[PDB]
Amino acid sequence: MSLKVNILGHEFSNPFMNAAGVLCTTEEDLRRMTESESGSLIGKSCTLAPRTGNPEPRYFGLPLGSINSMGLPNLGVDFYLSYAAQTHDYSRKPLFLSMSGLSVEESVEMVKKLVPITKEKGTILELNLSCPNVPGKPQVGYDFDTTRTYLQKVSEAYGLPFGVKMPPYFDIAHFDMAAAVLNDFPLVKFITCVNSIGNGLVIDPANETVVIKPKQGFGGLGGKYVLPTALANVNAFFRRCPDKLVFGCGGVYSGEEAFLHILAGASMVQVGTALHDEGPIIFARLNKELQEIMTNKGYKTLDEFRGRVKTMD
Amino acid sequence: MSLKVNILGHEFSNPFMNAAGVLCTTEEDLRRMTESESGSLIGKSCTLAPRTGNPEPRYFGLPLGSINSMGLPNLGVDFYLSYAAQTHDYSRKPLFLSMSGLSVEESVEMVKKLVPITKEKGTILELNLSCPNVPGKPQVGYDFDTTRTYLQKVSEAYGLPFGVKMPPYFDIAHFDMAAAVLNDFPLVKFITCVNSIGNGLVIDPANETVVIKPKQGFGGLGGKYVLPTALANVNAFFRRCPDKLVFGCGGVYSGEEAFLHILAGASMVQVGTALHDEGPIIFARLNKELQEIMTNKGYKTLDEFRGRVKTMD
C-alpha cells in the first residue's frame, strides 16, 4: 500500500498538508509542520510588507467548524523567502509558499523575489486569489477579468510552473468561466479548491452579538460547512482542466473525507480547521485512516481511484 | 406576548412560512400548509408550463441537512393562479406565489396573469432569481445585468409591489453590487435571503458514487450547512436596502435559529429542510420555541429585537 504522490517534479510521502492559514505563520509553526507526518506544508499567505491583520476577536470555533477574519497577518514576504532559502529541511518534505499580494503590482514584486529560490531549492508557488477577510479587497477569483490580469502578469514575472488558490464557485457557468481563464495559462499547473466560504455571519443568541469584531461579524467559514462545496469545486476543475492538477481544501477531519477529495480528483489534500483543533498529530491519524480505507477497498495506490468518482447519469 | 408581523398590508399571526420548494407543489400540500400554524405560505416556484423536474434520485437527506436537484417540478402557472383565485382561504393567512420563469419573456407572461388576482385577492409575488438545479440555466442573481433586465421588465409588466428570492452571495462587493441593482427598483419591497447553496457535491464513500442523479451529482445544499451564509445575506441586505424588507431562508430547525434570523433583520422566516423532515407540525413547535426565548429575554414583540443584532465595531 502506498500513499505517495509524484507531482510537479517532486516526491511526496502522502497527500496531506496544511491549508495556508493554519500552523504556518512563524518559524516555530513551520518547524512543527515540518516535523509532522504531513507530506508537505505551505507558508502563510503573505504580503510584500508585514501585516498584523484585523482587530480582535477574529477567530471563533464552532460546533461545525470555524469562522474567522484574520486579515492576512504575516511576517512579510522576505521572512517566508528566507525560511525557504535558509531554514526549511527539503530532505523531510517539499515546501509551498502562499503569496497573497493585495494588488497585481504587489503580487508581481513578490513572485519575482521567489524565482531564484524556486530555481535553487524547488520551492513551489501557490498564488492566492481567494482571501475573503481583507476590508476593501474583494476576492480576486470572483472577477474573471482581474483574475486574467493576475495570471498574465504572474506568468510573465515568475515564468515557472505555479498554482492558484481559488474561492468557491456555486454556479455551473462560473466553473465554465473560471476554467476558460485558467486554461489560457499553461504555467498554472495546479488549482486549490477551495478557500473558505466567504462572508458568513455567526450570532450568539445569549448576548445577541456577533462573535468576531472585523467587518460587523462577517468572516470566512471553515470545517464541516465546506465539504460538499469543496468536493464540487475539486471535481468541476478536475474535469474542466485536464492539463492541470487539483488540490482539495475544505472539511477534512478524517481519512474518509480525504478519500472523497481524492476520489473527486485531488492530488494533494489541505487540512485547516481540523488541524487548528487537533494540532499536527492529525497528519499521523489521517495517513492511518486513509491507508485503512484503501486496504479495505483493495487499492494499492492513490492513482487507482483519483478522480474516479462514479455518477448515475 | 405577540408573534404578529405587520408588513405588505397584512397582519401575519407569526413570522413563519414554508420555503418555496417544500410542502407547496400540489393542492393537498397547500391545504396542509394552510391548516398549519404557519403565519403564511408560498406556492411552489412555478413556470409557465408544467414541469416534472429532474430524474430520480434527486433528493438526499444528510446529517447536516440535504442535497437536491429537484429541477422546478410544478403544476404550471395556471394551477397556482387558480389556487390563489378560487381555493385559498385568505381568512386563515395571506398567500405568496413564487414565480420562476426560465427567461425574462416567460416571467413577464406569468406576472401579467397574476396582476388581476393580486388586485382582487391580495396574492403576493416572490420573483425567483435563484434556482441552481435547472441544467443550462445559471442562477440569474449572479448576473447583475440580467437581474436588472428581469427587475425592469417585471416592474413594467406587473406594476405592483413584489419581492425577489436571491441566491447567496459570498463577497462584500457582491452585496454592494446586488444592493445597487435592487435599490434602483422601488417596486421591489422584499428580498428573500437565501435559496440553497448551489452546486455542492455529496459522494457515498462505500460505493464511491454520487448520491443524486442529475448534473453528475451536483445539487443545492440546505439545512445546517446554510445558516451562517443565510444570516450574513439577511443582514447585508437589511443594512444596504433600508427601504425594503428582508425575509430569511436557511438553516431554521428551532426557535433559536428563527430568533437569529429576526435579530439579523428578517421580517418573515422561511422553513425548508426542517419542514421537509418534520412536516407542518413544525410550525406549532417553532411558535412555542420562539415565544419561550422571548419570555426568557423579557421581549413582548418581534419589533423589540428585529434587526438589533449587536456588533463589536
From Swiss-Prot, chains A, B:
GO terms for molecular function: dihydroorotate dehydrogenase (fumarate) activity; dihydroorotate dehydrogenase activity. The keyword Flavoprotein applies. Its cofactor is FMN. The keyword Transit peptide does not apply. CDD domains: DHOD_1A_like. GO terms for biological process: 'de novo' pyrimidine nucleobase biosynthetic process; 'de novo' UMP biosynthetic process; fumarate metabolic process. Homodimer. Catalyzes the conversion of dihydroorotate to orotate with fumarate as the electron acceptor. Molecular oxygen can replace fumarate in vitro. This is Dihydroorotate dehydrogenase (fumarate). It comes from Trypanosoma brucei brucei (strain 927/4 GUTat10.1). The lineage of its organism: Eukaryota, Discoba, Euglenozoa, Kinetoplastea, Metakinetoplastina.
